[PDB]
Design an enzyme around this catalytic site. Structure first.
Site, PDB file in Angstrom:
ATOM      1  N   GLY A  92       2.957   2.408   3.028  1.00 42.77           N
ATOM      2  CA  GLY A  92       3.868   1.328   2.712  1.00 42.77           C
ATOM      3  C   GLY A  92       3.597   0.717   1.353  1.00 42.77           C
ATOM      4  CG  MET A  93       4.367  -3.292  -1.231  1.00 40.93           C
ATOM      5  SD  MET A  93       5.961  -4.074  -1.529  1.00 40.93           S
ATOM      6  CE  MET A  93       5.477  -5.686  -2.133  1.00 40.93           C
ATOM      7  N   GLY A 141       1.232  -1.632  -5.670  1.00 48.66           N
ATOM      8  CA  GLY A 141       1.814  -0.305  -5.658  1.00 48.66           C
ATOM      9  C   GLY A 141       2.220   0.122  -4.265  1.00 48.66           C
ATOM     10  CB  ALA A 164       0.103   8.014   2.064  1.00 48.36           C
ATOM     11  CG  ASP A 175      -7.654  14.174   1.806  1.00 51.42           C
ATOM     12  OD1 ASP A 175      -7.784  15.104   0.977  1.00 51.42           O
ATOM     13  OD2 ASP A 175      -6.628  13.453   1.858  1.00 51.42           O
TER      14      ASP A 175
END
Ligand SMILES: O=c1ccoc2cc(O)cc(O)c12
Length: 343
Positions: free
Chosen positions: A23-24, A18, A21, A135
């Site tokens: 790249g890949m 996938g 936030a 977060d």
């Protein structure tokens, strides 16, 4: 960030996982360890924000070593700064995350217990390094097929700074809305450890019901969702909010009585709800600490302080990285990743 995926000869038989936030993300076969691993291609070098978060995450994850925090096994990049245009981060393969699991799977009480223990065990280490995650949420908790849980995404992490936590009412905030402690909206910059405990409480609630407990639709809606369940804060807790705009906002609201946890979560273990209550406490000074949560009766089958390690090297370094030109950020990323080069 993903098109070419050149991870040298060590890693082969690539499968797309996938986008993130940065790249890949792909899985690959590690021809040295003979296991499949995750590899992330990071292409951050065009935007200050991506570079700051990339440097921050790499610095933290290379310094931390803990079973419940994702590690970096290898970093692939060009041998010179001039040729460095991508960075590949290699990590243990984690087949899912808690967000994905909660969308489709009921969690037994035993799983809730085990997941919560692991979250808190990792958080104990983070906090012992004087670091705040800032977060925490289900999508930042990775799990593998044997239910090992690892905390990820240190892009918003900071060194704790309680003496400089105060701010005015409605100060803008970056971290995910639904997991923000009430004080973020009132008088806090999120520079104390109690903000992370609040987020864990929200995650516990979400594990109990498969739904976010406080799904606010806007900045102030988040606070109103919290107060709709906790009820109006007591006079004592309100006297701790000294700034007039925040105090008077709270005083302007209609009185609401607390909603009992057992009415929201009728199937939950009573010890789990007692711990939830202590994590989702309005006043951050009265809110339970990470080590008290580990010691709570709900977690008694797992609690073992001698097997709950703390950091050797707490952070006094800079995780703000705000006053650095992009040229220096790239150089710092180059230097931080040097240990993985053959040399
Ligand atoms: O599958 C993954 C998807 C995104 O982020 C990850 C991070 C890791 O450290 C290991 C992974 O397997 C993934």
């Amino acid at each position: 960030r993903g098109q070419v995926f050149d991870v040298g000869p060590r890693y082969t038989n690539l499968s797309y996982i996938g986008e993130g936030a940065y790249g890949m993300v792909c899985s690959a076969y590690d021809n040295v360890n003979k296991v499949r691993v995750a590899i992330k291609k990071i292409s951050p070098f065009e935007h200050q924000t991506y570079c700051q978060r990339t440097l921050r995450e790499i610095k933290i994850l290379l310094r931390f070593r803990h079973e419940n925090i994702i590690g970096i096994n290898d970093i692939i990049r060009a041998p010179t700064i001039e040729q460095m245009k991508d960075v590949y981060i290699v990590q243990d393969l984690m087949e899912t995350d808690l967000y994905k699991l909660l969308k489709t799977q009921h969690l037994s009480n035993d799983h809730i217990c085990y997941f919560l223990y692991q979250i808190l065990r990792g958080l104990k280490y983070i906090h012992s390094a004087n670091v705040l995650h800032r977060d925490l949420k289900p999508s930042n908790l990775l799990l593998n097929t044997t239910c090992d849980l690892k905390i990820c995404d240190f892009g918003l992490a900071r060194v704790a700074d309680p003496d400089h936590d105060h701010t005015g009412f409605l100060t803008e905030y970056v971290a995910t809305r639904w997991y923000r402690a009430p004080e973020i909206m009132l008088n806090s910059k999120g520079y104390t450890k109690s903000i992370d405990i609040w987020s864990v409480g929200c995650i516990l609630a979400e594990m109990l019901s498969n739904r976010p407990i406080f799904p606010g639709k806007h900045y102030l809606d988040q606070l109103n969702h919290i107060l709709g369940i906790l009820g109006s804060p007591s006079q004592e807790d309100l006297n701790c909010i000294i700034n007039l705009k925040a105090r008077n906002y709270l005083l302007s609201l209609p009185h609401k009585n607390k909603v009992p946890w057992n009415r929201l979560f009728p199937n939950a273990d009573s010890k789990a709800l007692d711990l939830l209550d202590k994590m989702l406490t309005f006043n951050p000074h009265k809110r339970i600490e990470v080590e008290q949560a580990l010691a709570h009766p709900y977690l008694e089958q797992y609690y073992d302080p001698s097997d709950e390690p703390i950091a050797e090297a707490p952070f006094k370094f800079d995780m703000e990285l705000d006053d650095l030109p992009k040229e220096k950020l790239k150089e710092l990323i180059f230097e931080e990743t040097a240990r993985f080069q053959p040399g």
